[PDB]
Amino acid sequence: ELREQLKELTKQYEKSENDLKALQSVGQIVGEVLKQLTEEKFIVKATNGPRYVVGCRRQLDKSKLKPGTRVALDMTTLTIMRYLPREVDPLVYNMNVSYSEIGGLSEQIRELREVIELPLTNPELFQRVGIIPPKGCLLYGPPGTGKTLLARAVASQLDCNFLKVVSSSIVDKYIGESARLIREMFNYARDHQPCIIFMDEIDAIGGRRFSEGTSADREIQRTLMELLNQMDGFDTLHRVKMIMATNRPDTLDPADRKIHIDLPNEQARLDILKIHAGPITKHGEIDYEAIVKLSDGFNGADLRNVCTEAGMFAIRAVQEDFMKAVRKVADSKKLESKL
Amino acid sequence: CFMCRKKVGLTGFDCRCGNLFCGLHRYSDKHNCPYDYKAEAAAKIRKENPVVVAEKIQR
Amino acid sequence: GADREVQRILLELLNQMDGFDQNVNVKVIMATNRADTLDPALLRPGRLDRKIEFPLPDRRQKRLIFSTITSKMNLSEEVDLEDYVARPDKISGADINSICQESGMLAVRENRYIVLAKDFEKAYKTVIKKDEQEHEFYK
Amino acid sequence: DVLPPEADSSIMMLTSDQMYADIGGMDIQKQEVREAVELPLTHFELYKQIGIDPPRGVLMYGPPG
Amino acid sequence: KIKENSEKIKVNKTLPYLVSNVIELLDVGKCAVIKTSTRQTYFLPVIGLVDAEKLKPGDLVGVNKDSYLILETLPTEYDSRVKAMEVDERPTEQYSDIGGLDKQIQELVEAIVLPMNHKEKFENLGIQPPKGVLMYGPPGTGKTLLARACAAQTKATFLKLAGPQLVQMFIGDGAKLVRDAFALAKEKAPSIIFIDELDAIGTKRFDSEKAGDREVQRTMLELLNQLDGFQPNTQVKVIAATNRVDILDPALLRSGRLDRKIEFPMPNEEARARIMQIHSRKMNVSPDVNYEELARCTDDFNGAQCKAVCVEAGMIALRRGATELTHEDYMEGILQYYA
Ligand SMILES: Nc1ncnc2c1ncn2[C@@H]1O[C@H](COP(=O)(O)OP(=O)(O)OP(=O)(O)O)[C@@H](O)[C@H]1O
Ligand SMILES: Nc1ncnc2c1ncn2[C@@H]1O[C@H](COP(=O)(O)OP(=O)(O)OP(=O)(O)O)[C@@H](O)[C@H]1O
């Protein structure tokens, strides 16, 4: 076992030596330069708060770094060691799948696609130069029409960067930073030009321009105002696309491309129930005619309820029981009666 | 799986006699559940009972 | 509370834009859209601020805005903008731009090469109006 | 040392933007803003002569959109 | 000497490995962008004693306060005492002793346990288990009873509702409690979330009374997000409890969020008899009882009043040290002109 023992010892030696070498490299301080002061002098505001003036190691191509660029100054002398790209800390989070597996929503999916995905495609303007295609879309929707699943489908379809963000971004440290998080979002997008930002539940932050309401109202309206400023204004975009989904009471955000999403469905209700019947065949008659005849609401979870309870039935005793599926249809409709 | 109805329902309520009684016959009064409900009450209440010691004895 | 901080910065801004005296080459501009909910203290009517409106356009302004927005657009001989503007409505500039954009979006949907009066009319519908509930009894 | 005047976070490159001739109409606002902030910054003598001091601040207040 | 390397690595890794975030990762080999309690931002070209891949933007890791090298990582942390409140000493009761209520327990036990244990049936049927559950305790009768009895399964954890309204006046936050709660549920094995007194949250969402309202609406919307967003949320089971049945959020309502809204009705005569029997099981009752006729006397005695009456009867008999039921001093414990 000479060779094997030697190999294992050598692997241990390698890893141990690498770890020791690793242990002997202090970190830097991250800070963004502010001015090219002369040549070997720069004013850098270290993130911790103090602002310093320091010189840079030669092998840094001073042309590279510029007002706003981040750099890693050294512990002791604080000379600029290495410039770094932009920084975005709490957003790897913001960056399943579905492909038109929802049913219905034909005209509205066509509109959404032609507004948000097609323009980004190779047919960029093709004489369409006159449009400056829409940068934002809205999703009027009652509670479950198919908004979030639509978002899932478009996210899995387009295949570019996606940032699904929610009105639960509000934070407080004896001051406001919601606008700061918003500008972080927008900067991230602008750097990653091809991207789909998706505000959802814009009702909360959208609120209204209430005056003399309270410190909370002022802060919330300030957050809204950051959104407005970075949607419109000097932050004009070219290759990002925005999505919104909530009810009507949203301050004032006209221009774009608002789409109504209707809770009831004509025969794509039949569709949706077939997709939700995708689960294993019932061992016989597959016609949905029973539930087809009467149907209201928006959910397919009735399918899950019937299937589970009918499996329980069968264990007590397949599920060739659309006569039984009408049972859970009536169940969901009595839930409707409740509200 | 209690003798009346010979029930096997997954909902079957499993009692201190480990027996998924009939939905209508799940009660000790009904099935002579041989358990010491009162003795367990006495033990638990003795354990949990607060007693005021008047806080006068001291080292 | 933090109202202290915000008011503090407000008065600092007031004092500083006052420190910008006259005979100066620093000109301050600010937006507020709606105004009524603003501080006369901030306005400092004595100086530091002159006020200007920015309302919705008149009919001639609508004509000019349509002409400007549509000149870049590949229109057609069947455009009829001189009557589209003449139509009575409360359209704003953002609404005109949305009209043109959505008309182009349709045009593209049906693969048009030059926008048409039909696309402008459809955009008019899809972007303007939608307002009802002025029930005839309600009025 | 006393650093050069500048040494702070702000925007001076102008980031480019889009020369006028494209807003469309709005002649009144155009003239007012141009006078107040744009040329001719020379007419300060006319201001002081008339006794009307140089306006500063516009507030550009109007309906959104 | 690999061992010696290990021991000296250990000793130079003394102990007080000041903990720091892992805010960002990069590469040029990989690096780190850690951030520290003392607001600071250290780039580390050598991350340290970590694989540099299991890390992910957002994480807590020990660090040498001077070297700023990421030392042994620590399991994620949960704030607002969500972890502390999310404890349970296996509630002692083992049986489902409630009373006449049978259909409610049936559906709840099915929809909860059967997915947990006999998920084989669900997978064979190709059915995702039943959706989030609500449990109307309009009077509260049996509400906590069913909750606690359900707290007798093989093994799981139950996230109680306890002050999700713990939000600061200065805007507060969108239920960071909710964020951490759902994070903990997601990370741990199959888990359940008992939203007690859900009525404390939830509303039409349009009323514009004043502040605090809007905070409750952000918390509500955070709840909605946590189960309706771009997340399967497969390994979760929400069970809600409310008494103000009518006034609740139309979106929180159901159909992907709170389905199978079990209802607690007023116990009938039989149900009252069963509950009083259950509470009397341990009572030193003499061999003579009119349980059924006492249930008849109940006359809308729905809630815990039965338990309170059994206790009051115990005290009543204890006046004299007895073990028998008078059956009428029992009514007076229950609780001129014509007649
Ligand atoms: N049109 C639909 N077709 C198929 N499944 C749907 C549809 N609408 C909702 N669902 C089902 O409901 C869940 C997703 O709900 P949905 O995306 O409609 O919510 P939402 O409209 O964003 O809700 P809310 O408005 O209440 O926030 C998934 O179970 C999805 O299967
Ligand atoms: N059916 C029942 N079986 C056993 N105990 C019951 C029953 N109904 C009420 N109780 C008693 O009620 C108390 C528990 O409260 P319960 O679960 O009924 O909720 P509640 O406080 O009435 O709820 P809510 O917050 O809606 O008012 C315990 O004393 C329990 O003994």
For residues E70 and E22, the answer to whether their CB atoms sit within 8 Å is: yes
Q: Can you give the three-state secondary structure of A25-65, one letter per residue? A: CCCCEEEEEEEECCCCCEEEEECCCCEEEECECCCCCCCCC
- With residues binned 3-state (H G I as helix, E B as strand, rest as coil), the percentages for chain B, rounded to 5, are 30, 5, 60
Smallest Cβ–Cβ distance between E95 and the set B9, B11, B16 belongs to B16
Q: Which tokens sit at C12?
A: 């600092």
User: Do the strands E19-21 and A136-140 form a parallel or antiparallel pair, or are they unpaired?
Assistant: unpaired
Return the SS3 of E133: strand
E58 is in an annotated binding site: no
| Cα–Cα separations (whole angstroms), residue E241 to A339, D4, E143, E262, E263 | 16, 66, 7, 10, 10
For residues E281 and B37, the answer to whether their CB atoms sit within 8 Å is: yes
Q: Which residues contact A156 (CB under 8 A, 6 or more apart)?
A: A96, A97, A98, A99
**C8 — phi, psi (to 5°)?**
-60, -50
Residue nearest to atom 28 of ligand 2 (CA): E304
- Touching A (3+ Cβ pairs <8 A), the chains are B, C, D, E
H-type alpha helices, chain E: 2-12, 82-85, 103-116, 119-125, 143-150, 176-187, 213-228, 269-280, 291-298, 305-318, 329-334
> Under an 8 A CB cutoff, do A37 and D3 touch?
yes
Residue nearest to atom 9 of ligand 1 (CA): A146
- Structural resolution in Å: 3.9
> Under an 8 A CB cutoff, do B27 and E282 touch?
no
D51 is in an annotated binding site: no
Q: Does A149 touch chain E (CB under 8 A)?
A: no
Q: Which residues contact C49 (CB under 8 A, 6 or more apart)?
A: C28, C42, C43, D56, D57, D58, D59
E101 CA closest ligand 2 atom index: 1
Q: Which tokens sit at C23?
A: 């005979």
Spatial distance between the Cα atoms of B53 and E73, rounded to a whole number of angstroms: 49
Q: Which tokens sit at C28?
A: 């301050």
Spatial distance between the Cα atoms of A274 and A292, rounded to a whole number of angstroms: 10
Measured in Å, residue A323 CA sits from the centre of ligand 1 at: 25
User: What is the DSSP-derived secondary structure letter of residue E164?
Assistant: T
A142 CA closest ligand 1 atom index: 25
Return the SS3 of E259: strand
The angle formed by the CA atoms of residues D10, D11 and D14, to the nearest 5 degrees, is 170
* Distance, CA of B34 to chain centre: 10
Sequential DSSP letters for A289-331: HHHHHS--SS-SHHHHHHHHHHHHHHHH-----HHHHHHHHHH
Return the SS3 of B4: helix
* Nearest Cα residue to A113 out of A77, A158, A143, A81: A158
Q: Which tokens sit at E217?
A: 């609406």
| Cα–Cα separations (whole angstroms), residue E170 to A170, A229, C10, E85, E163 | 11, 23, 19, 24, 17
Q: Which residues contact A209 (CB under 8 A, 6 or more apart)?
A: A221, A251, A252, C34, C37
**E279 — phi, psi (to 5°)?**
-70, -25
Sequential DSSP letters for D27-58: HHHHHHHHHHHSS-GGGHHHHHHHTPPPP---
Among B residues 6-25, those touching chain A with beta carbons less than 8 Å apart: 8-10
Q: Which residues contact E41 (CB under 8 A, 6 or more apart)?
A: A29, A30, A31, A46, A47, A48, E23, E33, E34, E35
Measured in Å, residue E178 CA sits from the centre of ligand 1 at: 22
Indicate contact of B with C: 3+ CB pairs under 8 A: no
Spatial distance between the Cα atoms of A75 and A54, rounded to a whole number of angstroms: 12
**C2 — phi, psi (to 5°)?**
-55, -20
Helix E269-280 and helix E305-318, axial crossing angle in degrees, nearest 10: 50
Q: Does E60 touch chain A (CB under 8 A)?
A: no
Sequential DSSP letters for A120-188: TSS-S-TTGGG----SEEEEE--TTSSHHHHHHHHHHHH-SEEEEEESTT--BSSSB-HHHHHHHHHHH
CA dihedral A211, A215, A220, A225 (to 10 degrees): 60
Closest approach of chain A CAs to the CA of E235, in angstroms?
14
Closest approach of chain B CAs to the CA of E330, in angstroms?
20
Sequential DSSP letters for E201-241: S---S-----TTHHHHHHHHHHHHHHHHSS----S-EEEEE
Q: Does D64 touch chain C (CB under 8 A)?
A: yes
Closest approach of chain C CAs to the CA of A216, in angstroms?
10
* Nearest Cα residue to C54 out of D65, D37, A228: D65
Q: Any bridge partners for residue A241, and if so which? A: A196
Spatial distance between the Cα atoms of E251 and E205, rounded to a whole number of angstroms: 9
* Nearest Cα residue to C106 out of C125, C123, C91, C93: C123
Helix E103-116 and helix E143-150, axial crossing angle in degrees, nearest 10: 30
Q: Any bridge partners for residue A242, and if so which? A: A136, A197
For residues A280 and E124, the answer to whether their CB atoms sit within 8 Å is: yes
Measured in Å, residue E240 CA sits from the centre of ligand 2 at: 16
Helix E213-228 and helix A215-231, axial crossing angle in degrees, nearest 10: 50
User: What is the DSSP-derived secondary structure letter of residue E173?
Assistant: -
CA dihedral E144, E146, E148, E150 (to 10 degrees): -150
Pocket of ligand 1 (CB under 6 A): A 102-104, 141, 143-149, 272, 298-300; E 224, 228, 251, 256
* Contact residues, chain A, for C100 at CB < 8 Å: 130-131
- Amino acid letter at A339? L
What count of Cα atoms within 13 Å lies in the side-chain half-sphere of residue A320?
5
Q: Does B28 touch chain E (CB under 8 A)?
A: yes
> Under an 8 A CB cutoff, do B8 and A316 touch?
yes
* Nearest Cα residue to E242 out of E147, E129, E130, E167: E147
Spatial distance between the Cα atoms of E108 and E240, rounded to a whole number of angstroms: 12
For residues C44 and C60, the answer to whether their CB atoms sit within 8 Å is: no
Q: Residue for token digits 């609780």?
A: E335
Kindly tell me the sign of the dihedral angle through the C-alpha atoms of D31, D36, D38, D43. Answer: positive
Residue nearest to atom 4 of ligand 2 (CA): E98
Closest approach of chain C CAs to the CA of D55, in angstroms?
6
For residues A245 and A112, the answer to whether their CB atoms sit within 8 Å is: no
E138 is in an annotated binding site: yes
Q: Does A317 touch chain B (CB under 8 A)?
A: no
* Distance, CA of A59 to chain centre: 39
The angle formed by the CA atoms of residues A222, A223 and A225, to the nearest 5 degrees, is 60
Helix or strand (DSSP H, E) at A333: helix A322-338
**D5 — phi, psi (to 5°)?**
-50, -55
* Contact residues, chain E, for B27 at CB < 8 Å: 274, 277-278
Q: Which tokens sit at E319?
A: 């006046």
Spatial distance between the Cα atoms of E275 and E267, rounded to a whole number of angstroms: 9
Return the SS3 of C99: helix
Q: Residue for token digits 């290990």?
A: E6
User: What is the DSSP-derived secondary structure letter of residue E44?
Assistant: B
H-type alpha helices, C1-139: 2-19, 40-43, 59-72, 81-84, 93-109, 117-127
For residues B35 and B28, the answer to whether their CB atoms sit within 8 Å is: yes
For residues B43 and E294, the answer to whether their CB atoms sit within 8 Å is: no
Q: Which tokens sit at E90?
A: 């296996």
Kindly tell me the sign of the dihedral angle through the C-alpha atoms of A83, A86, A89, A91. Answer: negative
Measured in Å, residue E91 CA sits from the centre of ligand 2 at: 15
* Distance, CA of E243 to chain centre: 17
> Under an 8 A CB cutoff, do A312 and B8 touch?
no
For residues A238 and A195, the answer to whether their CB atoms sit within 8 Å is: no
> Under an 8 A CB cutoff, do E39 and A47 touch?
yes
For residues A204 and A151, the answer to whether their CB atoms sit within 8 Å is: no
- Amino acid letter at A165? V
Q: Residue for token digits 């409106």?
A: C53
User: What is the DSSP-derived secondary structure letter of residue E128?
Assistant: P
Spatial distance between the Cα atoms of A315 and A310, rounded to a whole number of angstroms: 9
Indicate contact of D with E: 3+ CB pairs under 8 A: no
Q: Does D34 touch chain C (CB under 8 A)?
A: no
Q: Residue for token digits 């359209």?
A: C91
* Contact residues, chain D, for A34 at CB < 8 Å: 7-9
E139 is in an annotated binding site: yes
Smallest Cβ–Cβ distance between E40 and the set A9, A47, A305 belongs to A47
CA dihedral E64, E68, E74, E79 (to 10 degrees): 110
Helix C2-19 and helix A215-231, axial crossing angle in degrees, nearest 10: 60
Helix or strand (DSSP H, E) at B29: helix B28-31
User: What is the DSSP-derived secondary structure letter of residue E53?
Assistant: S
Spatial distance between the Cα atoms of A229 and A253, rounded to a whole number of angstroms: 11
The angle formed by the CA atoms of residues E192, E195 and E198, to the nearest 5 degrees, is 160
Spatial distance between the Cα atoms of A297 and E339, rounded to a whole number of angstroms: 56
Smallest Cβ–Cβ distance between C50 and the set D55, D63, D64 belongs to D55
Helix A268-276 and helix A301-316, axial crossing angle in degrees, nearest 10: 40
Interface contacts (C, D; CB < 8 Å): 103
For residues E55 and E62, the answer to whether their CB atoms sit within 8 Å is: no
Helix or strand (DSSP H, E) at A198: strand A195-200
Q: Write the burial class of residue E8 (CB in 10 Å: 0-12 exposed, 13-18 middle, 19+ buried).
A: middle
- Touching D (3+ Cβ pairs <8 A), the chains are A, C
Q: Hey, how many other C-beta atoms are within 10 angstroms of the C-beta on A239?
A: 16
